[PDB]
């Protein structure tokens, strides 16, 4: 795994000692080389995980997320120009090296063995995102966005450390196998309830759950495109990855103590799909869509079926690609007009006649068009929750209907019916944004053909 760690380090002084019109080809080319390098990883088989050291290992939950991260970096790096290319050279280098250090701590986090190392690399994942969104937050409340961001994620993720140290000095070391192979059930004393509450509540904060989802929308409407893609895709599915690992312990009380969180997630999934039907600020609709999909994820995690975990990890990867793509299209539209609102930029079936093809393709993946991965995820989660209870399918189908309607409203609101004919500044589509769309929607369809890779440990 150090074969992946150390070139991610050595991609950083590259960016320092390259010059003007020389950083760019180096960073993008070499990051795509690292994408091939981790495409080499996928060997995992049968009996167990694969151990890349006495320190690192990979579960098959971790392999598609790690490949998704090293796929998403060069896409992101090309995406984050034309809004900072006119800024200074040293600040641009600092931005690129910030993203590289960010990816480095993401690889650190996904290839964890011990949960304490996982926690250190969790908040090391946190700290570059803060600096990016605050330095290039590009709107008047990036102050409040970063402040809400860091205080929610730390103050939720703070007692998780205490609970993990307590588990450390009551059950030996914290390798995932020695967390396994030795775990004993823990009864319904209230200390067990608070310990489970601490761990599960910290990752509840990081998903988000419904009672703590206003962490999210300021932190995406007042962020640059790179930090937004990082935050949405890699950080929310990293929180899901963490709960998927640490839910191995404390199974004999999660049945008794999991009842309020499921109901909060279900009714809040309905309320969040309702709240993103009527808002302006088009950038935020994808954020509330993300809250809806993560509520479905949390339903899938707290029910404990292998069907549920397969559907959960498929929903994770497909929604990560969908949200990152659709953030990039919203950034394209904001590069067109300086509005960020929804009802202003209209028309665009005439003009840019193939940008609409990418909007349609993203909107139908967010619809969960049926050969795609998102319908695979949502379908197996609905199957597992109907085996959980014979009644919850009302909420799932009503989520499906309202999700169809707001995704279609996003499609046919801003890009259907009449141009406002006082715009007269939008350029025809560059090769760059079309290349970014092509980097998004080739792997999603190629996994739609052969999806046996991305299913979880319970394959």
């Amino acid at each position: 795994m150090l074969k992946y760690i150390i070139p991610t380090m050595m991609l950083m002084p590259l960016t320092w000692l390259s010059k003007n019109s020389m950083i760019w080809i180096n960073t993008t080319l070499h990051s795509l080389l690292i994408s091939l390098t981790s495409l080499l990883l996928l060997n995992q088989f049968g009996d167990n995980s694969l151990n890349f050291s006495l320190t690192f290992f990979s579960d098959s939950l971790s392999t598609p997320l790690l490949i998704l991260t090293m796929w998403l970096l060069p896409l992101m790096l090309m995406a984050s120009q034309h809004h900072l290319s006119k800024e200074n050279l040293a600040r641009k280098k600092l931005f690129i090296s910030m993203l590289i250090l960010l990816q480095l701590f993401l690889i650190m986090t996904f290839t964890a063995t011990e949960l304490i190392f996982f926690y250190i690399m969790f908040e090391a994942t946190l700290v570059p995102t803060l600096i990016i969104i605050t330095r290039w937050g590009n709107q008047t409340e990036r102050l409040n966005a970063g402040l809400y961001f860091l205080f929610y994620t730390l103050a939720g993720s703070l007692p998780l450390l205490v609970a993990l140290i307590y588990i450390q000095n009551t059950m030996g070391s914290l390798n995932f196998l020695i967390l396994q192979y030795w775990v004993q059930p823990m009864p319904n004393s209230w200390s067990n309830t608070f310990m489970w509450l601490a761990c599960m509540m910290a990752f509840m904060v990081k998903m988000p759950l419904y009672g703590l989802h206003l962490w999210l929308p300021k932190a995406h409407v007042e962020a640059p495109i790179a930090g937004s893609m990082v935050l949405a895709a890699i950080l929310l599915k990293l929180g899901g990855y963490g709960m998927m690992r640490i839910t191995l312990l404390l199974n004999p009380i999660t049945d008794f103590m999991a009842y309020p969180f499921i109901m909060l997630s279900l009714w809040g999934m309905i309320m969040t799909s309702s709240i993103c039907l009527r808002q302006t600020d088009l950038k935020s609709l994808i954020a509330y869509s993300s809250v809806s999909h993560m509520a479905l994820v949390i339903v899938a995690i707290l029910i404990q079926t292998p069907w549920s975990y397969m559907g959960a990890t498929a929903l994770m990867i497909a929604h990560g690609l969908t949200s990152s793509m659709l953030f990039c299209l919203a950034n394209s539209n904001y590069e067109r007009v300086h509005s960020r609102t929804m009802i202003l930029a209209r028309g665009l079936q005439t003009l840019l006649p193939l940008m609409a093809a990418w909007w349609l393709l993203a909107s139908l993946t967010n619809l969960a068009l049926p050969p795609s991965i998102n319908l695979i995820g949502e379908l197996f989660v609905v199957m597992s929750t109907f085996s959980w209870s014979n009644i919850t399918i009302i909420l799932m189908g009503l989520n499906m209907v309202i999700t169809a309607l707001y995704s279609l409203y996003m499609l046919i609101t801003t890009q259907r019916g009449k141009h406002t004919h006082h715009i007269n500044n939008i350029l025809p589509s560059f090769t760059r944004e079309n290349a970014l769309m092509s980097l998004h929607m080739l792997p999603l369809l190629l996994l739609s053909l052969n999806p046996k890779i991305i299913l979880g440990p319970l394959y």
Binding site: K3, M10, L14, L17, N26
Partner: protein, 52 residues
């Protein structure tokens, strides 16, 4: 053409370096060379190895 530009050649050298160091670390981790109950044959035919 190496001294033309050495900037562009850095990351494959780094990848080969990390690969070599992972080889050396797994060879330092050469416990249980044949002591499993499920993967245990004799050393055959030439030189005393089953993985390296």
């Amino acid at each position: 053409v190496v001294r033309d530009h050495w900037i562009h050649v850095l990351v494959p050298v780094g990848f080969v370096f990390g690969y070599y160091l992972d080889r050396k670390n797994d060879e330092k981790l050469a416990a249980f060379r044949n002591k499993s109950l499920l993967y245990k044959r004799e050393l055959k035919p030439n030189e005393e190895v089953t993985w390296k």
